[PDB]
Design a protein around this ligand. Structure first.
Ligand SMILES: C#CCN1C(=O)[C@@H](C)N(CC)c2nc(Nc3cc(F)c(O)c(F)c3)ncc21
Length: 316
């Protein structure tokens, strides 16, 4: 059911005008978009428009995240004060309401990106280098600190939700906030309890226990991503139709991190920073603020160990 006539001009709530183009990648109802002009929206368009029915829960949740935490100035303010090269939270350009065929739709204008990391990962035979993984993880730590300090957790960090800057292949961005969770509304942390799951292979022990995600869970998810990226595998990958198996493995390997290193890496040739990252996350209570700079330090020690430095090069 077509939501737009191709090339039509749509006006957002702040009266900014946009033109709609073709769908991206033959990834659901997302289309190329540009500023209104006399030219057609081209295949090098710098924005996308996401469109779902107005009763779509996830789009409303995602829009609320973008309006509260991803305003171009809010981001740029943070980049200067923390002294970052960039921050991989996608920019929000506007949103509005669009009727078609007597149905109401919601739309949101975002940055357009290049390729997702999962596509690149599979093309490199399901491996990322130790250099790539550390540089990705440093930048993801910057993103998680930001969203966490703005009252949200992601709950679903993975290669397919990591997109490259369209014009810069060394900058990575975390997308999909449709099931993001505001863990700390008005600074009051949610209780250790359910709310009225993420991706099974990567999700947190907390999520497996049926409680709402928190900050430690995000860090833990990143942890499993690093092992998947480094080795091409996780121990529980043949049992993903059985959540209790996956939880059991995760609980046992959290309690004995050395056995996880033994299982996932050969020999006694496990990258030490990974074990250290996991131990640090293990110390966090459900409500506790992570010490993000100590986690970045642990990763930076890994870069030093391979004769490199945080030069921002993702090396893909
Ligand atoms: C064209 C092209 C490349 N391209 C793809 O192939 C795939 C991987 N996707 C879908 C994820 C893309 N998505 C975006 N923008 C975007 C989408 C969001 F859902 C979102 O929340 C957001 F902030 C930005 N630009 C380009 C691509």
């Amino acid at each position: 059911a077509e939501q737009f006539a191709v090339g039509e001009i749509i006006t957002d709530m702040a009266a900014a005008a946009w033109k709609v183009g073709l769908p991206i990648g033959q990834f659901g109802c997302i289309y190329l978009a540009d500023m209104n002009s006399s030219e057609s929206v081209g295949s090098d368009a710098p924005c996308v428009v996401k469109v779902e029915p107005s009763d779509n829960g996830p789009l409303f949740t995602e829009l609320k995240f973008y309006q509260r935490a991803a305003k171009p100035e809010q981001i740029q303010k943070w980049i200067r004060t923390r002294k970052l090269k960039y921050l991989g939270v996608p920019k929000y350009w506007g949103s509005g309401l669009h009727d078609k065929n007597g149905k109401s739709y919601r739309f949101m204008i975002m940055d357009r990106f290049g390729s997702d990391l999962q596509k690149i990962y599979e093309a490199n035979a399901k491996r990322f280098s130790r250099k790539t993984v550390l540089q990705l993880s440093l930048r993801i730590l910057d993103i998680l600190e930001y969203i966490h300090e703005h009252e949200y957790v992601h709950g679903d960090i993975k290669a397919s939700n990591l997109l490259l800057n369209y014009k810069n292949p060394d900058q990575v961005y975390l997308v999909d906030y449709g099931l993001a969770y505001r863990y700390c509304p008005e600074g009051v942390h949610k209780a250790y309890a359910a709310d009225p799951d993420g991706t099974i292979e990567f999700t947190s022990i907390d999520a497996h226990n049926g409680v709402a995600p928190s900050r430690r869970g995000d860090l833990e998810i990143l942890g499993y991503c690093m092992i998947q990226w480094l080795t091409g595998h996780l121990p529980w990958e043949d049992n993903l139709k059985d959540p209790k198996y996956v939880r059991d493995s995760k609980i046992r390997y959290r309690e004995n991190i050395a056995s996880l290193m033994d299982k996932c890496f050969p020999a006694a040739n496990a990258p030490g920073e990974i074990a250290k990252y996991m131990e640090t996350v293990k110390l966090l209570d459900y409500t506790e603020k992570p010490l993000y700079e100590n986690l970045r330090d642990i990763l930076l020690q890994g870069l030093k160990a391979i004769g490199s430095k945080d030069d921002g090069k993702l090396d893909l």
